[PDB]
Ligand binder design. Sequence first.
Ligand SMILES: CCNC1CCN(c2ccncc2)CC1
Length: 185
Amino acid sequence: HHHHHHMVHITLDRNTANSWLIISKDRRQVRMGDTHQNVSDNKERFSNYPMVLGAQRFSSGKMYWEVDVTQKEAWDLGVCRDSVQRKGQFSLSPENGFWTIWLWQDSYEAGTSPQTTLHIQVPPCQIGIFVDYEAGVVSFYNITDHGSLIYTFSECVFAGPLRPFFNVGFNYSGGNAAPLKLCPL
Ligand SMILES: CCNC1CCN(c2ccncc2)CC1
């Protein structure tokens, strides 16, 4: 792909984070803490899952960013409507305002309803995310495997401003403490 020149500088929005997340000072890294991180509750926070939004809102144009997932067992990544449900249980689907992929139990899936099997020969250490607002496209690329295509959501009905979306996943196994990191341009 040749999307690198639409690179945008993504930072994480602390106010949207699940209360167990630790976001780095530069707002480019997030990990699961071993306890409540001593913040007040607010209506923005994801309550049930270890999720956080980027601060950036997109309503036009072409945007590209990269996320480091090295040594993680579980994570979700992509974009979502600014207006997604924050509280309680929900599925990651375009009907609920999410355009995501994930790693779970040694398999990679796209957040369709129902979910779609991905075919990845080289486990990614970095993921590229490309959004074309006007075209209605979200695409994911395997940076570790020379930028090979992982998945394209097309005919997307965004129906609002988009935000970068992250889930560091639970760490019940003790094998998923590693952070998500926004890679430098
Ligand atoms: C058959 C239903 N399975 C559910 C549990 C596992 N899952 C994930 C795993 C990781 N991130 C998001 C969703 C899909 C829904």
